[PDB]
Design a binder for this molecule. Structure first.
Ligand SMILES: [Mg+2]
Ligand SMILES: [Mg+2]
Lengths: 142, 110, 152, 102, 184, 72, 54
RNA sequence: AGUGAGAACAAGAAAAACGAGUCGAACCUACUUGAUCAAAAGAGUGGGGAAACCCCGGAAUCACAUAGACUCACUUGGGACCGAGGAUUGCAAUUAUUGGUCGCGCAACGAGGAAUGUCUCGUAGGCGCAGCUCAUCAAACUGUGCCGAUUACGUCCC
RNA sequence: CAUAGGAUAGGCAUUCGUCGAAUUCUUCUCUGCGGGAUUCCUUGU
């Protein structure tokens, strides 16, 4: 951005237990953590006051600690309720938004919930089969 | 156990207008489209077997019924299409149709 | 000497200048004034469900509703739905063929609602939206500015 | 004037002109000050089915068409003078329709 | 006041001639205000030799499904190509193109007529295959490259104009002629 | 591989203001492999040299911008 | 008991519709609200008035 | 991600029923609203029996000196897979009907072996749009327009 | 005479839910029948 590189520019920064390529732009490297994506990483850069032009390795430690609590607790920052991943959360009831290690954790807890009871959508994951209304005659091929 | 942040004792209490606000969107649409529609006799004969003592297995063809907390603890024998599959309604089954618990096919083994 | 009168012609209007030069200066006029009412939803939302990510220009609600103000100057009587055909997209469905989608008339409703509060749009006699006489004054005076290159 | 519009619609191209030119040649005898017969656009109607009743063969098709011919005439006569212009035994398959404008 | 068109209001057609006197009828040097003309050059057999040579570069760019029908793009994409060719060569770029077309295709070739006999190449095909092999190869250069298409197209035209072997066409122009010389 | 830098070092920005105005036919892809910087910097580095009048803008479009040295 | 044609009483489906000539409910032409079966139409296109021009 | 210019073919509501021999409602639609705040909706109010209303039919390719982001990476390419809200069609959505929202994207795929199909000018290819199936659902087919070439104008080799 | 600002026509300046009045028109539009193309003309096979 016609500005010189800083002395502290990490090529890989680590946020939410995830390696993040600091050579990228700031939202598009902030989508590398699970649960974020492009449409939400522009809201983390907007609520943190981070310019979207800057590269992700120039984010200092006080800027990365502000990002990680926008992602862990987004409803305190008026990111709206419809924007979140886990909104009505059966067996909890509360709206959440799942971070890096938590997306894959509660995904396994949802596939175990539907397999404890013998619900058909949990029986499809036990056999490895397709879950939605796909035909799976000519296109599985795994 | 818990369903949408309520145990089985708050679940039973809850009104049918407030339970409709609790469930997911397909279940609450089924409930709004059966507000004045003379409920199925599966629900009536389900509590007539509950009073005695698992209770007796009541048989049905109904598979588009949403499981309510009033159905919890009652064995339903759901018809897949050629037999009756005996399924005890545990508390984690709230909101799911009865057809999700009796497969109408066998998993294929080659 | 690029700015001068051509012969006997003495003034400008819309369709006598560039369309982007008008919309960019009208967007520039709205935020420099400050009397615009930008809604709080324009930070969070997306211009249509056919767009796949957020408009990524922080002045996008100023560039929209200046394009819309130009789109009442041409086609008076245009409603929200006729504007949705103007700003619609070709949506990317995944492995299926792309189909045209018209834009969300929500932001087009806010865009006309902001321009009414400026006084630049009137709600029309029987049809949708009409440019007030102050808006004809605004659209042409700003368009004379962009030919004499006073973009601000 | 009352400005009655007669709508001549038909499926035959040779019967719609043999009514309209006959209907116009009646309405010159009373000096009615007509507005001339306009030819509204002919609407063709496509049903493109398969040819086969079975399923096989080369998948051949055949498009069927049906054109509707459409004429209107505006005349300023009163409502029982236009029934004098209208009353004559026409060809079969030509519909005439009396309408009063405003 | 017929101000005798340049090409993009910049590049004149006044000085064009051809080094190859074999190829003078088939390289057309008539003037245009843009490459795009939308005429029917394909009805008669040799009529596409009367099409202007700067248009025929724009037609050669419209390949591979991502380019079929994008002539207004190829006119734009050639607008920046001809300006880069002026910066590399410090010459009239249209003369650089006519010098590139004249050197771009092999004078001789080999086909089976009965063995694999060496056969002469008509002047029409030598204008076709020069345009074809320069649009090709500049297309393959820029396929996963940092370089833009108006640079890779501008590099093939320059190196073929000089007769350098760095051009894609001149590697194949010399491969075909030596195979034709051995298949005599 | 082709590992390009994503911001200027102080050494290579001094290459931008000295060697690049001496080139003929400057484009943001010519600068990207001569100076080993991404084109998003190389195009940004050349817009800076036009407003200082060190290089000339000879051809401009929305995507492709071709620059040349100024001869004076 | 008169449950007798209770599914055919409600008329929403492909079974409620029918070829008006030929009594079949497979492949009917419903364009222009014509409601003739595909095969039973080509026998009757000339009397309805359709002629194959092209 | 913006912004501009801007097509043609077309479709569109009902019965010896239920309601006020005449008229209504079923169909498509603009426009307002919802809106002191996401889409998707949900509502009012007009109009149209269709050259009369949709409609100055604001299609998408394209375009742009947009001084817009990316910069050669399995990457802001690709969007398969599936998780969680929500809303509409239906008498009924489970073996997700469909749309929309945020996730996932670490699913191959970097231009494709032997083989193989179609095509000679407004054509191929690209691009969308209607109609038809249709309560709800087009990667289909029948039509229509838009952008618009390469090559040959030959031969009996297969 | 854009923050850096190129290329490109020029008697009575121009623009139009402005939901204006008038008063003359068929250039484009629609379309029932009809013209037009025939190797017709020209100079090698
Ligand atoms: Mg119908
Ligand atoms: Mg292989």
């Amino acid at each position: 951005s016609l500005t010189l590189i800083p002395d502290h520019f990490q090529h890989i920064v680590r946020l939410l237990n995830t390696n993040v390529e600091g050579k990228r732009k700031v939202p598009f490297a902030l989508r590398m953590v699970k649960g974020v994506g492009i449409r939400f990483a522009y809201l983390v850069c907007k609520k943190a006051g981070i310019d979207v032009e800057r590269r992700a390795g120039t984010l200092t430690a006080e800027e990365l600690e502000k990002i990680a609590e926008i992602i862990a607790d987004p409803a305190k920052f008026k990111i709206p309720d419809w924007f979140l991943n886990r909104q009505r959360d059966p067996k909890t009831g509360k709206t959440e938004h799942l971070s890096s290690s938590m997306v894959d954790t509660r995904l396994r807890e949802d596939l175990e919930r539907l397999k404890k009871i013998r619900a058909h959508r949990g029986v499809r994951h036990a056999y490895g089969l397709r879950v939605r209304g796909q035909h799976t005659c000519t296109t599985g091929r795994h | 156990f818990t369903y949408r942040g309520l145990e089985i004792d708050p679940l039973l209490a809850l009104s049918e207008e407030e339970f409709r606000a609790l469930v997911h969107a397909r279940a609450r649409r089924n409930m709004n489209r059966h507000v004045d529609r003379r409920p199925p006799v599966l629900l009536k004969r389900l509590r007539e077997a509950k009073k005695h003592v698992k209770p007796k297995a009541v048989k049905t063809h109904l598979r588009d019924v949403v499981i309510t907390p009033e159905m919890v603890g009652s064995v339903v024998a759901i018809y897949n299409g050629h037999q009756f599959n005996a399924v005890e309604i545990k508390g984690e089954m709230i909101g799911h149709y009865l057809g999700e618990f009796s497969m109408s096919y066998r998993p294929v083994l080659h | 000497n690029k700015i001068h009168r051509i012969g006997k012609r003495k003034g400008a209007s819309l369709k006598d200048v560039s369309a982007w030069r008008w919309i960019k200066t009208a967007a520039r006029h709205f935020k420099q004034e400050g009397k615009i009412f930008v809604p709080n939803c324009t930070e969070i939302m997306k211009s249509s469900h056919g767009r796949e990510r957020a408009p990524q220009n922080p002045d996008w609600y100023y560039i929209r509703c200046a394009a819309v103000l130009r789109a009442i100057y041409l086609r008076p009587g245009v409603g929200y739905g006729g504007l949705s055909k103007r700003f619609g997209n070709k949506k990317n469905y995944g492995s299926r063929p792309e189909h045209t989608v018209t834009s969300s008339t929500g932001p087009l409703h806010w865009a006309c609602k902001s321009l009414t509060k400026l006084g630049l749009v009137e709600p029309g006699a029987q049809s949708g939206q009409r440019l007030t006489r102050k808006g004809h004054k605004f659209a042409d005076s700003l368009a004379f500015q962009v030919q004499i290159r006073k973009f601000g | 004037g009352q400005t009655v519009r007669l709508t001549i619609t038909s499926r035959n191209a040779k019967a719609v002109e043999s009514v309209t030119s006959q209907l116009l040649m009646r309405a010159r005898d009373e000096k009615v000050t007509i507005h001339g017969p306009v030819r509204l656009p002919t609407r063709t109607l496509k049903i493109t089915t398969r040819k086969t009743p079975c399923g096989n063969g080369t998948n051949t098709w055949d498009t069927f068409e049906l054109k509707i011919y459409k004429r209107i005439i505006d005349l300023h006569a009163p409502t029982e003078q236009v029934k004098k212009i209208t009353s004559f035994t026409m060809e079969s398959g030509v519909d005439v329709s009396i309408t009063i404008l405003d | 006041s017929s101000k005798t068109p340049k090409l993009f209001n910049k590049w004149s057609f006044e000085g064009l001639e051809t080094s190859e006197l074999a190829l003078r009828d088939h390289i057309s040097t008539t003037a245009a205000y843009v490459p795009h003309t939308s005429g029917r050059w394909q009805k008669r057999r040799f009529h596409k030799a009367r099409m202007p040579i700067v248009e025929r570069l724009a037609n050669g760019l419209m390949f591979k499904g991502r380019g079929n029908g994008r002539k207004l793009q190829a006119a734009r994409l050639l607008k920046h190509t001809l300006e880069i060719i002026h910066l590399l060569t410090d010459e009239n770029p249209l003369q650089v193109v006519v010098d590139a077309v004249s050197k771009g295709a092999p004078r001789e070739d080999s086909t089976r007529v009965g063995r694999r006999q060496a056969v002469d190449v008509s002047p029409m095909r030598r204008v076709n295959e020069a345009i074809y092999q320069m649009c090709k190869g500049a297309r393959e250069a820029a396929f996963r490259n940092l370089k833009s298409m108006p640079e890779c197209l501008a590099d093939e035209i320059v190196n073929a104009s000089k007769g350098s072997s760095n051009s894609y066409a001149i590697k194949k122009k010399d491969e075909v002629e030596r195979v034709a010389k051995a298949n005599r | 591989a082709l590992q390009n830098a994503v911001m200027f070092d102080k050494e290579t920005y001094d290459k931008l203001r000295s060697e690049v105005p001496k080139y003929k036919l400057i484009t943001p892809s010519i600068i990207s492999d001569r100076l080993k910087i991404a084109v998003s910097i190389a195009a940004a580095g050349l817009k800076q040299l036009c407003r200082e009048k060190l290089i000339r803008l000879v051809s401009c479009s929305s995507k492709t911008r071709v620059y040349t040295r100024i001869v004076q | 008991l008169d449950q007798w044609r209770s599914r055919q009483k409600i008329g929403m489906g492909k079974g409620a519709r029918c070829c008006v000539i030929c009594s079949n409910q497979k492949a009917l032409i419903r364009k222009y609200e014509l409601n003739v079966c595909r095969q039973c139409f080509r026998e009757n296109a000339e009397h309805i008035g359709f002629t194959k021009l092209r």
